[PDB]
Curated annotation (Swiss-Prot):
Superkingdom assignment: Eukaryota
Its job: Aminopeptidase with broad substrate specificity for several peptides. Involved in proteolytic events essential for cell growth and viability. May act as regulator of neuropeptide activity. Plays a role in the antigen-processing pathway for MHC class I molecules. Involved in the N-terminal trimming of cytotoxic T-cell epitope precursors. Digests the poly-Q peptides found in many cellular proteins. Digests tau from normal brain more efficiently than tau from Alzheimer disease brain.
Biological process annotations from GO: cellular response to hypoxia; peptide catabolic process; positive regulation of protein targeting to mitochondrion; protein polyubiquitination; proteolysis
Protein name as it appears in the record: Puromycin-sensitive aminopeptidase
Thermal dependence of activity, per record: Stable up to 40 degrees Celsius.
Binding-site residues for Zn(2+), renumbered to this chain: 302, 306, 325
InterPro entries assigned to the protein according to its UniProt record, in alphabetical order: Aminopeptidase_N-like_N (IPR045357), Aminopeptidase_N-like_N_sf (IPR042097), ERAP1-like_C_dom (IPR024571), M1_APN-typ (IPR034016), Peptidase_M1 (IPR001930), Peptidase_M1_aminopeptidases (IPR050344), Peptidase_M1_dom (IPR014782), Peptidase_M4/M1_CTD_sf (IPR027268)
Residue numbers marked as site, Transition state stabilizer: 388
Gene of this entry: NPEPPS
Keyword set, alphabetical order: Aminopeptidase, Cytoplasm, Hydrolase, Metal-binding, Metalloprotease, Nitration, Nucleus, Protease, Zinc
Length: 864
């Protein structure tokens, strides 16, 4: 792959598109003011799905020279326009009229099917250019570093709204068609082609004015303007936040957020015309959830952050796309936390992007964040959950290492320097290094140019009133000690806190050595020391036995902040699974979480303990681990109770469902008895139970029930009114333990009553229900493999079916059985999932064989 010759660079695009609705085509003429930087007889542009009618180049004050040479290259999406004579150095005007198609590929200038408040089913002209789809709406230099200005004009019917990046400056009628009106927009600033936008359709709107004076609007489908009210007030507060943080005002005169029906791309940060899907922007009071208002605040703060970082300063090439998306994925939480501190959104960030990035970065076949991108198709291949989640995580670690003071100063220097220009990743490290005086380029190279993350072991020794800390780093792997003689090293900024001040840094350091000693002044032995305050650093911490015991009071009295308790527990399970520490040592810490009130902490607690419970189901003491789980969740269960208390939040309703479901599955007698009261009153029409208590009650009564309970659930599903109620049952049907009922649920999955896209959910619940239910699910998909393979081959569902079925196995002999099955019955699209699952089975197998009897003897001694 090679970029455009750059002998002719654009200056201003004058576009006038007439979307031909019903015919699903469009015609448009382009007057592109350009500069010939080098004498050439041909101009090379990007173009796809567009046939040029005629094209001519008119130099300044001269007659136009029509192009008599066309060359369409579809594999490279580039077209060469040859001319009889050399165009020579200077400024000219390239005039190109052409015709295009409003395709159904949800890319470029395509058609978007929407339904009126009555029906009829109409289509709209919606745009989407990122990454390289602007060449499908009009021929252009479709590269982010080839910036120019845009004059957008649209010839739309009178009964349809036409929006674009800028505001409307003229609305003159169309001469050839009285039913059409040409809408001309203002001239955009210097910007990239992939950020241009224009939409034609029928939309209602709600408007407001931000404190900066910017006109804010939220465009909704016809008849849903009230649903975009919340997104409006969030966007109205988001702009002043980024204005104060960047010390740079909003670069455009207006901001528009339009909700589109079934928008495939989800959300696009088009400069001045941010597009969303209505299921992610609007809040339907009779269909939305509880945390929906939280999800809207995040998606608004993310795309509005791109209006500065991404649109005002654009990446030089797609190699730096991780930094564009990683920064926005981090600062979106900073914006929501400032406007809504009652969310404690940083605890959910650690539970989302942070932990998911550490899972992938600790396994084989990982890759560094920044990878050189040649062809723009290589993007979709080498960027995944690693480049974005770990990308946002290293930005958070960098912000804490810099400090909010110097970080704001460096970003203001960065934006003002490269405004309406392009910059690389190294340019950002320079602007931050100038404002902070810290070696940012050197530190960030260890986190971007190599894969993996370090494990920080810390040991403590009391020296007078100070405490000496001995730190060492090594590459962390989910299997254990990293086998390899390269010995990776990281420059690790580490924030340390003590019990005297658990919410602010006791000492900030930078570990640029494999081993390093640190002295914490005035630290009494009765005080605990916590590494990685706020879990801002992208690394795992292994505490010594003495240091871990010192942290136990901090967990119990909640003095350790919730984000720190979340990261501490998550590291312990990873280290125990990797064989670095014993599982018994982790189980003793679980007893200190009995006072945990935070929902996010319990969610990760329940997830980790669920992995261990299903692992220990292969042993002869599965009753002992269930009794252990009941003791951990009993106090929080009694605190929450069964009915909502006066003045609860939305997380408290979610936390009640998680705790009660955990106790119900573990056999908690008081929970099982109450769940049967609610379930028998729900099926007899005496008092329908809440939707929050519905899933835990179903799980509890079905696991401890019989064939009568299963028939009741099947009657509740075949009679279920909506689809949502059906899915809530399909996930819990696998909780039955009786073999003949398990086979009945598996056969029910492939029946006509269950839709094929939800069949994997039913079988998934069977594999996760019990040990024999997992073996029955694995045998079920082998006997019916011909039907199941024909159903979901080449799709996402076949990888999800294999994942949910075999990941629970804890026998190393079983890992060799799933590998031998897919070598005789190939599944090509799920080749990567089989390798990850086989490595996960062997990991759980070694983990199980190493710590089985140790856990057993710990549970027996603890009970006495
Ligand atoms: Zn983004």
């Amino acid at each position: 792959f090679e970029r455009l010759p750059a002998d002719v660079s654009p200056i201003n695009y004058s576009l006038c598109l007439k979307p031909d609705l019903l015919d699903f085509t469009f015609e448009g003429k382009l007057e592109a003011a350009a500069q010939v930087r080098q004498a050439t007889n041909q101009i090379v542009m990007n173009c796809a799905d567009i046939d040029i009618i005629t094209a001519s180049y008119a130099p300044e004050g001269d007659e136009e020279i029509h192009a008599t040479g066309f060359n369409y290259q579809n594999e490279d999406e580039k077209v060469t326009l040859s001319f009889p004579s050399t165009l020579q150095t200077g400024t000219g005007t390239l005039k190109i009229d052409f015709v295009g198609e409003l395709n159904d590929k949800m890319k470029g200038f395509y058609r978007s099917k929407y339904t009126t408040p009555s029906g009829e089913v109409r289509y709209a002209a919606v745009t989407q250019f990122e990454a390289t789809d602007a060449r499908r709406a009009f021929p252009c230099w479709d590269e982010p570093a080839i910036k120019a200005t845009f004059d957008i004009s649209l010839v739309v019917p009178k009964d349809r709204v036409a929006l674009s990046n800028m505001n409307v400056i003229d609305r003159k009628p169309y001469p050839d068609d009285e039913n059409l009106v040409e809408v001309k927009f203002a001239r955009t600033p210097v910007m990239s082609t992939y950020l241009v936008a224009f939409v034609v359709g029928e939309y209602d709107f709600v408007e407001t004015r931000s404190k900066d004076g910017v006109c804010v609007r939220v465009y909704t489908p016809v008849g849903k303007a009230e649903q975009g009210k919340f997104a409006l007030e969030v966007a109205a507060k988001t702009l002043p936040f980024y204005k104060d943080y960047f010390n740079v005002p909003y670069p455009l005169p207006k901001i528009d957020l339009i909700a589109i029906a079934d928008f495939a791309a989800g959300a696009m940060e088009n400069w001045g015309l941010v597009t969303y899907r209505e299921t992610a922007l609007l809040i339907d009071p009779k269909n939305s959830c509880s945390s929906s208002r939280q999800w809207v605040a995040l998606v608004v703060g993310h795309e509005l952050a791109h209006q500065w970082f991404g649109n005002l300063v654009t990446m030089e090439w797609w190699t730096h796309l991780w930094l564009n998306e990683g920064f926005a994925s981090w600062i979106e939480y900073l914006c929501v936390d400032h406007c809504f501190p009652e969310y404690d959104i940083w605890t959910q960030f650690v539970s989302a992007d942070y932990t998911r990035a550490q899972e992938l970065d600790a396994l084989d076949n990982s890759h560094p964040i920044e990878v050189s991108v040649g062809h723009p198709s290589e993007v979709d291949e080498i960027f995944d959950a690693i480049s974005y989640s770990k990308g946002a995580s290293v930005i958070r670690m960098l912000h804490d290492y810099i400090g909010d003071k110097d970080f704001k100063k460096g970003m203001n220097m960065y934006l003002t320097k490269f405004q309406q220009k392009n910059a690389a990743t190294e340019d950002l490290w320079e602007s931050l290094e100038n404002a902070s005086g810290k070696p940012i380029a050197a530190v960030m190279n260890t986190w971007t140019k190599q894969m993996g993350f370090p494990l920080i072991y810390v040991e403590a020794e009391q020296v007078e009133d100070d405490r000496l800390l001995r730190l060492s780093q090594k590459k962390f792997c989910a299997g254990g000690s990293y086998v390899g003689e390269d010995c990776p090293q990281w420059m690790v900024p580490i924030t340390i806190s003590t019990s005297e001040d658990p919410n602010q840094a006791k000492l900030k350091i930078l570990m640029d050595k494999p081993e390093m000693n640190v002295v914490l002044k005035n630290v009494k032995p009765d005080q605990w020391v916590k590494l990685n305050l706020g879990t801002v650093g992208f690394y795992r911490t292994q505490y010594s036995s003495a240091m871990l015991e010192s942290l136990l009071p901090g967990i119990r009295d909640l003095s350790l902040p919730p984000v720190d308790r979340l990261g501490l527990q998550n590291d312990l399970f990873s280290l125990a699974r990797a064989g670095i520490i014993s599982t018994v040592e982790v189980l003793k810490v679980m007893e200190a979480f009995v006072n945990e009130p935070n929902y996010t902490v319990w969610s990760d607690l329940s997830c980790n303990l669920g992995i261990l419970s299903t692992l220990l189901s292969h042993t002869d003491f599965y009753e002992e681990i269930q009794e252990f789980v009941k003791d951990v969740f009993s106090p929080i269960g009694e605190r929450l109770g069964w009915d909502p208390k006066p003045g609860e939040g939305h997380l408290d309703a979610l936390l009640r469902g998680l705790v009660l479901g955990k106790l119900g599955k573990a056999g908690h007698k008081a929970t099982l008895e109450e769940a049967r009261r609610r379930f028998k009153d729900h099926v007899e029409g005496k008092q329908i139970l809440s939707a929050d208590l519905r899933s835990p009650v179903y799980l509890t009564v079905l696991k401890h029930g019989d064939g009568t309970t299963l028939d009741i659930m099947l009657k509740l599903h075949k009679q279920a009114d909506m689809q949502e109620e059906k899915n809530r049952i399909e996930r819990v049907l696998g909780a039955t333990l009786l073999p003949d009922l398990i086979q009945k649920v598996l056969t029910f999955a492939l029946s006509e009553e269950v839709r094929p896209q939800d069949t994997v959910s039913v079988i998934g619940g069977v594999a996760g229900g019990s040990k024999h239910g997992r073996k029955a699910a694995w045998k079920f998909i082998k006997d019916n493999w011909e039907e199941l393979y024909n159903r979901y081959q080449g799709g996402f569902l076949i990888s999800r079916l294999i994942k949910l079925s075999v990941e629970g196995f804890a026998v190393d002999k079983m890992a060799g059985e799933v590998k031998a099955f897919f070598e005789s019955h190939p599944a090509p699209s799920a080749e990567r999932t089989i390798q990850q699952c086989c490595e996960n089975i062997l990991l759980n197998a070694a983990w199980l064989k190493r710590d089985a009897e140790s856990i057993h003897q710990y549970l027996l001694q603890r009970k006495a």
